[PDB]
C-alpha cells in the first residue's frame, strides 16, 4: 500500500494499556498464582502468551473471570513476565532467571525463553 | 532499573491484537458510524483516542456495548483511523485527507491531526 507509519504508535499503545492496568481499568480476568492474584486484560495476555492465547480462544474458558495457574508456577516469575507483557522490559536477575525461564516456558513466551537460555549459557 | 528490553515486543503485541480484531475475538464494543458498524476492543480504542478514553472511563458508558458517533463523522475516515489504531499505518490520500483530519480531531488523535495539517500545508 501507500500508507505512512507512526514509529512510536505501538509503544504508545502499550504504555497506555499499562496505565489502564495500573488503574485497574477494563481488566476482565484475575490470574491466580499460588496465594497471589494478578488482574489483567485477556487480549494483552493472549497477544503475549501462547498459553493464554489457547485458553481464551477456547469457547468455554473465554468466559472465565478467574484462571488458576499450575501450583509449580512461582508468583514472582509470573509478576516479572506480566510486567514484561505490558512494558517490553524484562527484570532478569541471577536470583530470578530460573523461575522466569520456567514460567516463560509454561506461558509459551518464546522470545523470553530464548534470552533466558542465552544468559544461562553465558554463566 | 537493570531491565533488558525486547525491541519488537510492542509491535508484535499490536500485530496480535489486530489478528484478534480480524477474527472478531474478544471484541467488546460496536462503533456505529452512520449506517456502518465497526467491532473493536475498548482498551485499544482508549489507548489510541482521547475521545474513547473519556467515554470508557465514564462509570456509565464503560458498560455500553454500542457507541454511536456524531452523524457528521464519515465511515471511511473512521475505518482508516481504526486500521491505524491497530497497525500504526495510516492510509492518507488526497481524496480522504479532509475526512481523516476531521475524524482524528473528533477522536482526539493528536499525532494523526499533526501529520494531516503538515500534508495539507505542503499542498
Amino acid at each position: 500500500d501507500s500508507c505512512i507509519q507512526f514509529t512510536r504508535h505501538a509503544s504508545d499503545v502499550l504504555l497506555n494499556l499499562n496505565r489502564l492496568r495500573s488503574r485497574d481499568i477494563l481488566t476482565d480476568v484475575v490470574i491466580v498464582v499460588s496465594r497471589e492474584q494478578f488482574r489483567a486484560h485477556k487480549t494483552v495476555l493472549m497477544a503475549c502468551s501462547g498459553l493464554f492465547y489457547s485458553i481464551f480462544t477456547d469457547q468455554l474458558k473465554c468466559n472465565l473471570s478467574v484462571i488458576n495457574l499450575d501450583p509449580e508456577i512461582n508468583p514472582e516469575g509470573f509478576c516479572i513476565l506480566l510486567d514484561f507483557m505490558y512494558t517490553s522490559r524484562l527484570n532478569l536477575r541471577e536470583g530470578n532467571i530460573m523461575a522466569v525461564m520456567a514460567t516463560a516456558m509454561y506461558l509459551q513466551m518464546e522470545h523470553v525463553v530464548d534470552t533466558c537460555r542465552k544468559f544461562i549459557k553465558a554463566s | 532499573d537493570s531491565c533488558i528490553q525486547f525491541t519488537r515486543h510492542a509491535s508484535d503485541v499490536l500485530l496480535n491484537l489486530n489478528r484478534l480484531r480480524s477474527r472478531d475475538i474478544l471484541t467488546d464494543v460496536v462503533i456505529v458510524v452512520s449506517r456502518e458498524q465497526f467491532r473493536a476492543h475498548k482498551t485499544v480504542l482508549m489507548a489510541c483516542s482521547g475521545l474513547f478514553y473519556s467515554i470508557f472511563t465514564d462509570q456509565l458508558k464503560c458498560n455500553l456495548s454500542v457507541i454511536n458517533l456524531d452523524p457528521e463523522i464519515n465511515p471511511e475516515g473512521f475505518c482508516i483511523l481504526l486500521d491505524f489504531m491497530y497497525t500504526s499505518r495510516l492510509n492518507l490520500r488526497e481524496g480522504n485527507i479532509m475526512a481523516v483530519m476531521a475524524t482524528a480531531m473528533y477522536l482526539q488523535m493528536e499525532h494523526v491531526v499533526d501529520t494531516c495539517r503538515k500534508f495539507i500545508k505542503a499542498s
Binding site: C3, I4, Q5, F6, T7 | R89, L90, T115
Partner: peptide, 4 residues
C-alpha cells in the same frame, strides 16, 4: 512518521 516514515515510509514503512
Amino acid at each position: 512518521w516514515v515510509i514503512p
